[PDB]
Amino acid sequence: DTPENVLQMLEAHMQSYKGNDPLGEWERYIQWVEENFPENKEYLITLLEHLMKEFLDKKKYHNDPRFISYCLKFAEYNSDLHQFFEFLYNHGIGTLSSPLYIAWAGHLEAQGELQHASAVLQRGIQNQAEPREFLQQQYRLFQTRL
Protein backbone atom coordinates (compact mmCIF):
# COMPACT_ATOMS: atom_id res chain seq x y z
CA ASP A 1 0.00 0.00 0.00
CA THR A 2 2.94 2.30 0.79
CA PRO A 3 3.41 3.82 -2.73
CA GLU A 4 -0.18 5.03 -2.85
CA ASN A 5 0.38 6.25 0.69
CA VAL A 6 3.20 8.67 -0.05
CA LEU A 7 1.04 9.85 -2.94
CA GLN A 8 -1.82 10.57 -0.58
CA MET A 9 0.55 12.29 1.83
CA LEU A 10 1.74 14.54 -1.01
CA GLU A 11 -1.70 15.06 -2.50
CA ALA A 12 -2.87 16.36 0.89
CA HIS A 13 0.14 18.53 1.54
CA MET A 14 -0.68 20.14 -1.78
CA GLN A 15 -4.20 21.14 -0.68
CA SER A 16 -2.75 23.10 2.23
CA TYR A 17 -0.22 24.68 -0.12
CA LYS A 18 -1.16 28.31 -0.43
CA GLY A 19 1.73 29.30 -2.63
CA ASN A 20 3.16 30.05 -6.01
CA ASP A 21 5.26 27.08 -7.03
CA PRO A 22 3.51 23.69 -6.95
CA LEU A 23 6.31 22.11 -8.95
CA GLY A 24 8.76 22.93 -6.16
CA GLU A 25 6.69 21.02 -3.59
CA TRP A 26 6.57 17.92 -5.73
CA GLU A 27 10.31 18.16 -6.00
CA ARG A 28 10.66 18.06 -2.20
CA TYR A 29 8.57 14.90 -2.06
CA ILE A 30 10.05 13.30 -5.17
CA GLN A 31 13.60 13.88 -3.94
CA TRP A 32 12.50 12.39 -0.65
CA VAL A 33 11.46 8.99 -1.94
CA GLU A 34 14.55 9.14 -4.12
CA GLU A 35 16.89 9.34 -1.12
CA ASN A 36 14.83 6.75 0.76
CA PHE A 37 13.74 4.07 -1.71
CA PRO A 38 16.57 3.00 -4.03
CA GLU A 39 14.91 -0.32 -3.23
CA ASN A 40 11.54 -0.12 -4.96
CA LYS A 41 11.26 2.27 -7.87
CA GLU A 42 7.57 1.64 -7.29
CA TYR A 43 7.46 4.90 -5.35
CA LEU A 44 9.25 7.07 -7.89
CA ILE A 45 7.08 5.66 -10.69
CA THR A 46 3.83 6.43 -8.93
CA LEU A 47 4.87 9.92 -8.03
CA LEU A 48 6.25 10.50 -11.52
CA GLU A 49 3.01 9.37 -13.17
CA HIS A 50 0.99 11.75 -11.04
CA LEU A 51 3.46 14.54 -11.65
CA MET A 52 2.58 14.26 -15.35
CA LYS A 53 -1.14 14.01 -14.90
CA GLU A 54 -0.98 16.94 -12.51
CA PHE A 55 1.08 19.16 -14.76
CA LEU A 56 -0.20 18.05 -18.17
CA ASP A 57 -2.33 21.18 -18.37
CA LYS A 58 -0.09 23.58 -16.53
CA LYS A 59 1.47 25.20 -19.58
CA LYS A 60 3.68 27.43 -17.49
CA TYR A 61 5.78 24.45 -16.38
CA HIS A 62 6.23 22.84 -19.79
CA ASN A 63 9.71 24.24 -20.22
CA ASP A 64 10.67 24.25 -16.56
CA PRO A 65 13.99 22.39 -16.40
CA ARG A 66 12.98 20.52 -13.28
CA PHE A 67 9.69 19.33 -14.73
CA ILE A 68 11.48 18.31 -17.95
CA SER A 69 14.11 16.53 -15.91
CA TYR A 70 11.44 14.40 -14.23
CA CYS A 71 10.04 13.76 -17.67
CA LEU A 72 13.44 12.38 -18.77
CA LYS A 73 13.74 10.50 -15.48
CA PHE A 74 10.32 8.90 -16.03
CA ALA A 75 11.19 7.98 -19.60
CA GLU A 76 13.52 5.36 -18.10
CA TYR A 77 10.50 3.48 -16.76
CA ASN A 78 8.53 3.64 -20.02
CA SER A 79 8.08 0.64 -22.31
CA ASP A 80 7.89 2.62 -25.57
CA LEU A 81 10.33 5.50 -25.84
CA HIS A 82 9.24 6.43 -29.39
CA GLN A 83 5.70 6.96 -28.28
CA PHE A 84 6.72 8.65 -25.05
CA PHE A 85 9.04 11.25 -26.56
CA GLU A 86 6.62 11.96 -29.38
CA PHE A 87 3.90 12.49 -26.78
CA LEU A 88 6.05 14.96 -24.88
CA TYR A 89 6.86 16.79 -28.06
CA ASN A 90 3.40 17.18 -29.43
CA HIS A 91 2.07 18.45 -26.12
CA GLY A 92 4.74 21.15 -26.03
CA ILE A 93 6.52 19.65 -23.05
CA GLY A 94 10.22 20.44 -23.39
CA THR A 95 9.91 21.82 -26.92
CA LEU A 96 12.29 24.66 -25.96
CA SER A 97 14.63 22.37 -24.04
CA SER A 98 17.89 21.13 -25.58
CA PRO A 99 18.04 18.10 -23.26
CA LEU A 100 14.74 16.75 -24.58
CA TYR A 101 16.01 16.95 -28.14
CA ILE A 102 19.38 15.46 -27.17
CA ALA A 103 17.86 12.60 -25.12
CA TRP A 104 15.26 11.81 -27.75
CA ALA A 105 17.52 11.86 -30.80
CA GLY A 106 20.09 10.07 -28.67
CA HIS A 107 17.78 7.11 -28.31
CA LEU A 108 16.98 7.29 -32.04
CA GLU A 109 20.67 7.22 -32.97
CA ALA A 110 21.27 4.35 -30.53
CA GLN A 111 18.54 2.52 -32.49
CA GLY A 112 20.44 3.10 -35.70
CA GLU A 113 17.66 5.38 -36.92
CA LEU A 114 20.05 8.05 -38.12
CA GLN A 115 17.59 9.98 -40.31
CA HIS A 116 14.95 10.26 -37.58
CA ALA A 117 17.66 11.36 -35.13
CA SER A 118 18.75 14.02 -37.58
CA ALA A 119 15.23 15.52 -37.88
CA VAL A 120 14.69 15.59 -34.13
CA LEU A 121 18.00 17.39 -33.61
CA GLN A 122 17.32 19.85 -36.43
CA ARG A 123 13.83 20.58 -35.17
CA GLY A 124 15.23 21.45 -31.76
CA ILE A 125 17.55 23.90 -33.50
CA GLN A 126 14.78 25.36 -35.67
CA ASN A 127 12.66 25.80 -32.53
CA GLN A 128 15.55 27.62 -30.77
CA ALA A 129 15.69 25.15 -27.87
CA GLU A 130 18.10 26.27 -25.07
CA PRO A 131 20.95 25.96 -24.34
CA ARG A 132 21.37 26.75 -28.05
CA GLU A 133 25.07 26.00 -28.38
CA PHE A 134 24.83 22.74 -26.47
CA LEU A 135 22.24 21.47 -28.97
CA GLN A 136 24.31 22.76 -31.87
CA GLN A 137 27.34 20.95 -30.55
CA GLN A 138 25.61 17.60 -30.17
CA TYR A 139 24.14 18.02 -33.64
CA ARG A 140 27.68 18.47 -34.98
CA LEU A 141 28.86 15.34 -33.17
CA PHE A 142 25.94 13.47 -34.66
CA GLN A 143 26.97 14.69 -38.15
CA THR A 144 30.51 13.26 -37.96
CA ARG A 145 28.80 9.87 -38.30
CA LEU A 146 27.74 10.63 -41.90
Partner: peptide
Protein backbone atom coordinates in the same frame (compact mmCIF):
# COMPACT_ATOMS: atom_id res chain seq x y z
CA UNK B 1 8.72 -0.70 -16.64
CA UNK B 2 5.18 0.53 -17.34
CA UNK B 3 3.05 0.37 -20.45
CA UNK B 4 3.37 3.76 -22.08
CA UNK B 5 0.37 3.20 -24.36
CA UNK B 6 -1.99 2.52 -21.43
CA UNK B 7 -0.39 5.32 -19.45
CA UNK B 8 -0.75 7.95 -22.17
CA UNK B 9 -4.28 6.78 -22.95
CA UNK B 10 -5.38 7.53 -19.37
CA UNK B 11 -4.09 11.02 -20.29
CA UNK B 12 -6.86 12.58 -22.42
Amino acid sequence: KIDTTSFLANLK
